[PDB]
Amino acid sequence: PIETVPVKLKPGMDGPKVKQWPLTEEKIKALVEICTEMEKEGKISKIGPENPYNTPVFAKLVDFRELNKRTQDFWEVQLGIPHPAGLKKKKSVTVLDVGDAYFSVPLDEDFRKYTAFTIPSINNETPGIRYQYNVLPQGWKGSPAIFQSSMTKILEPFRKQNPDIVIYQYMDDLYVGSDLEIGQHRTKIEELRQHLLRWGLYTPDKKHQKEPPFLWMGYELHPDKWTVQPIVLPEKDSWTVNDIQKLVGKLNWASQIYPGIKVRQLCKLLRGTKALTEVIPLTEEAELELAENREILKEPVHGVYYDPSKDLIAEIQKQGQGQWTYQIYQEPFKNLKTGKYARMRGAHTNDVKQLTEAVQKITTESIVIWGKTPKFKLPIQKETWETWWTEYWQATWIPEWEFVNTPPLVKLWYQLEKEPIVGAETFYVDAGYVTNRGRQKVVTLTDTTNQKTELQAIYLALQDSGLEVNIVTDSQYALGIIQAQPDQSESELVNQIIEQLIKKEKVYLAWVP
Amino acid sequence: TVPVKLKPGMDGPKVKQWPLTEEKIKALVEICTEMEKEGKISKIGPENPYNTPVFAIKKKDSTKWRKLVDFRELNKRTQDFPHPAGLKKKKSVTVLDVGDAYFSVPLDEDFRKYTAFTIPSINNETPGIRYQYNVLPQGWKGSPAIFQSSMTKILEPFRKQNPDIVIYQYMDDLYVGSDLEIGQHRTKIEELRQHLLRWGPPFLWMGYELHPDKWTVQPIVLPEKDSWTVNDIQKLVGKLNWASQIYPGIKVRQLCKLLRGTKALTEVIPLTEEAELELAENREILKEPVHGVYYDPSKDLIAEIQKQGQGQWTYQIYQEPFKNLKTGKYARTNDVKQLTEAVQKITTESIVIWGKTPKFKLPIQKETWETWWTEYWQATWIPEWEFVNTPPLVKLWYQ
Numbered sequence A: 001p002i003e004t005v006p007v008k009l010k011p012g013m014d015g016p017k018v019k020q021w022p023l024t025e026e027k028i029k030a031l032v033e034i035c036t037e038m039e040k041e042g043k044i045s046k047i048g049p050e051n052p053y054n055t056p057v058f059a060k061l062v063d064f065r066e067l068n069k070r071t072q073d074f075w076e077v078q079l080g081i082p083h084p085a086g087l088k089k090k091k092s093v094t095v096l097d098v099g100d101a102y103f104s105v106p107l108d109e110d111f112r113k114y115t116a117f118t119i120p121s122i123n124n125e126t127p128g129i130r131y132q133y134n135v136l137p138q139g140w141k142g143s144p145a146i147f148q149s150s151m152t153k154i155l156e157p158f159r160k161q162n163p164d165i166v167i168y169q170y171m172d173d174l175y176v177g178s179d180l181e182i183g184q185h186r187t188k189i190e191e192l193r194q195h196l197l198r199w200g201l202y203t204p205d206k207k208h209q210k211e212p213p214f215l216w217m218g219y220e221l222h223p224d225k226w227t228v229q230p231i232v233l234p235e236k237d238s239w240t241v242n243d244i245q246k247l248v249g250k251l252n253w254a255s256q257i258y259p260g261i262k263v264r265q266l267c268k269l270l271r272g273t274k275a276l277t278e279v280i281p282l283t284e285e286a287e288l289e290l291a292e293n294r295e296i297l298k299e300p301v302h303g304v305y306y307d308p309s310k311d312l313i314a315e316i317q318k319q320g321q322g323q324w325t326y327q328i329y330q331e332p333f334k335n336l337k338t339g340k341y342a343r344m345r346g347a348h349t350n351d352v353k354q355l356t357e358a359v360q361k362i363t364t365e366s367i368v369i370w371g372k373t374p375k376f377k378l379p380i381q382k383e384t385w386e387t388w389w390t391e392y393w394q395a396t397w398i399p400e401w402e403f404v405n406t407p408p409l410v411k412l413w414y415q416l417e418k419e420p421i422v423g424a425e426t427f428y429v430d431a432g433y434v435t436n437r438g439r440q441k442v443v444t445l446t447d448t449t450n451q452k453t454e455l456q457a458i459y460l461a462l463q464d465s466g467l468e469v470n471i472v473t474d475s476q477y478a479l480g481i482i483q484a485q486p487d488q489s490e491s492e493l494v495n496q497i498i499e500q501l502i503k504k505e506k507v508y509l510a511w512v513p
Numbered sequence B: 001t002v003p004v005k006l007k008p009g010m011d012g013p014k015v016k017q018w019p020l021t022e023e024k025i026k027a028l029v030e031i032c033t034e035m036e037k038e039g040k041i042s043k044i045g046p047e048n049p050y051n052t053p054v055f056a057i058k059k060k061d062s063t064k065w066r067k068l069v070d071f072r073e074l075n076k077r078t079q080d081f082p083h084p085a086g087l088k089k090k091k092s093v094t095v096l097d098v099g100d101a102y103f104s105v106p107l108d109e110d111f112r113k114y115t116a117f118t119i120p121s122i123n124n125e126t127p128g129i130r131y132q133y134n135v136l137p138q139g140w141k142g143s144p145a146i147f148q149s150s151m152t153k154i155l156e157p158f159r160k161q162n163p164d165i166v167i168y169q170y171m172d173d174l175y176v177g178s179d180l181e182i183g184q185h186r187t188k189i190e191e192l193r194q195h196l197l198r199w200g201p202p203f204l205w206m207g208y209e210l211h212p213d214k215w216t217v218q219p220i221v222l223p224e225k226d227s228w229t230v231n232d233i234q235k236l237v238g239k240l241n242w243a244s245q246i247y248p249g250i251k252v253r254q255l256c257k258l259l260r261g262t263k264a265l266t267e268v269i270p271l272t273e274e275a276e277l278e279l280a281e282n283r284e285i286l287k288e289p290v291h292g293v294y295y296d297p298s299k300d301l302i303a304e305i306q307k308q309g310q311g312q313w314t315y316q317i318y319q320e321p322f323k324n325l326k327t328g329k330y331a332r333t334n335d336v337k338q339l340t341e342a343v344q345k346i347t348t349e350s351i352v353i354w355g356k357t358p359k360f361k362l363p364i365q366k367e368t369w370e371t372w373w374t375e376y377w378q379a380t381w382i383p384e385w386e387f388v389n390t391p392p393l394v395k396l397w398y399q
């Protein structure tokens, strides 16, 4: 039949010795009919009360919590799953369901002892039937793995005699596609159900098998196109904090295919909310957004599948301050997948840093769906990039990319002078300043942190100065912040400074102990 | 087979496998499929819960892929089992990859499960091939030790028939030193190659010689300049101050004095006599590594790098802050490529000098690093590493 996977209990641990709950003569009756049907099929077998282990049964459910707590760990039933975009179209695709899947496979002979349970007697000093499993008990720790594992082992053969047939194994289901004519396709599928039958693995026949599209893990899978199972936007007039959370949630999921989905305004609605059932009224911008999404959703878009023969193009756009959108395709607008990126790494950044980070995310994502990186189309020119890169303290790398003139283009809104500016006033800051020209202002700040006091000073200087300044400061903090040439900030003060900076012609910042 | 065990109470590794590019994957498939046929490795079942990350790297001016197994975690949990201070003085050293030697020695059957590794599939469309080693694996700290004996033997002839040569082995590498002429060297090297074939072969680093005899410390430097502006001086004092924490003999008193008043940055300042002499001394003080720093073998060897620019980097190897065992420079491509090349370079030096690898501090983002390093990596070992945010002031204070 199939090999047997050697199991073991965790070290220094004995099998489960737990008392069977008192049953019912009505429930005892059913268990015995079930356990007898089963022993005639070999799945189980009466044991000699030589066995001191026991696992609770009820009505047929067997509670293996305890055994599981004592059973060795197995290799992950792998939680990584395919993304529809990484698929190559097939003409026909058949979903093969598996019944008794688990019961179909044996169990390490030396382990069965541990799977013991007892069917109580009806009369006091009469029986009290004892058994053990010879197969894979559902609810058991190792079943899913041994199964998958074993399953895998079986298809391998068939798989090599049919390199045209593609098979994905997912829990008790089994997706099988091919580029064969419906007929030869339907043929192999039986060739398969057979191969699986030689190991007594029941799969339903074509009459009952499920038909396409295939609604898998929130997707709608055909053999030539893909989408996420369509979504309905509520038309409520009263919105609960929870309602919004759920909506936002759903909205996201869309983004991997539906281009243009925004949630900034809906998200804003959560600020300060005090209970999952609190009702928040919609804002003008919020409903505008909701409607725009609703609209975008009305029209169903479907994603195309992967054609390894062709290149992968990734194209990125700035959709807002801090928002980026992208799409990856092989043929123009012939999307495989789309997506957004709002991740802000650091309290302050610039589009260059952000765009670059956006590229990494994408890159990573591709090596995973396609095992290769795409050729990028970006709204920034090499000169701008290089400039930044070249002068940033962190090592960075962007693959093959083509500048694409799609506004808004990303640029550096300002650059600090690399050397003091000749004949430009010199401000010395420590909340107040002093210039070489005699000017000064010692201002007042309340509720200000140490770090935030420093930045205030600099702001002053920037304020009162002309289009060219030299600014000396002892704050390594501030220096750092500004030297990173951010253009957006979580902090308001910064943003104000940033505004100054951009206005200037030439600015020089220096540090002193 | 010799019994090997994990350190008391420790279990085997269960590290996730970083996703790989189809290219790298097929290379590994091709490779592993033949390692199986040769019974070096064996497919394993679900009852094995362990795992280690594998990667495919390329051989230099060679057309084959090398399989690299990140046995870092494992090596840390494997039971514990010297070093020629003469090597670092040798004029020439060549590094060889004696990795394939290990494959003739079987691995204790009960340790095997710990070497489990996995070959991923693209987009998780297939479970993923799983294996464990049957023979000593390249990269495992146990393999050299376990092979030590068999090594000394086949090496005792050349060691006495050519004791002008120093030979050091670190993991899969053999560091062969000498003072001969670069032509005599390359020859004696080639011979050892067949002398190893007799008793059975690659060189790492482009069939090239490290010239450790030519490794020096990058002293801290000061701008020598015609006229000195206020800015110039401010930078000067700042640099000095930092540097004063290392060399306490440094005084800035006079320099700081040319700075009284709130003068324009660009205003030139002719320096006084006292100032000039104070600089002279400080300049003299920095002419050499600080006295007192010694290599503690019981401590971690740390290595920080800084990006300077134009393809230039600065590193410093130490055990205790400010107390540098070595400082260097590296100059060229792209940032990453360069970075990796520096790491490998800096590691090789650490091995040669102290026979140990450093713990790097890197100026890059993990995701980016995880993504590209394997592309330019060629070494057979893998240093440890963490990711940091270099301070603009430190980059300033070097090169």
Ligand SMILES: Cc1ccnc2c1NC(=O)c1cccnc1N2C1CC1
Pocket (backbone or CB within 6 Å): A082, A087, A088, A089, A090, A093, A166, A167, A168, A175, A176, A177, A178, A214, A216, A221, A222, A223, A224, A305, B125
């Ligand atoms: C859920 C799933 C996971 C992985 N691959 C597939 C599927 N299901 C499909 O419907 C599918 C669609 C298009 C191409 N391959 C597909 N299949 C491949 C097996 C024929």
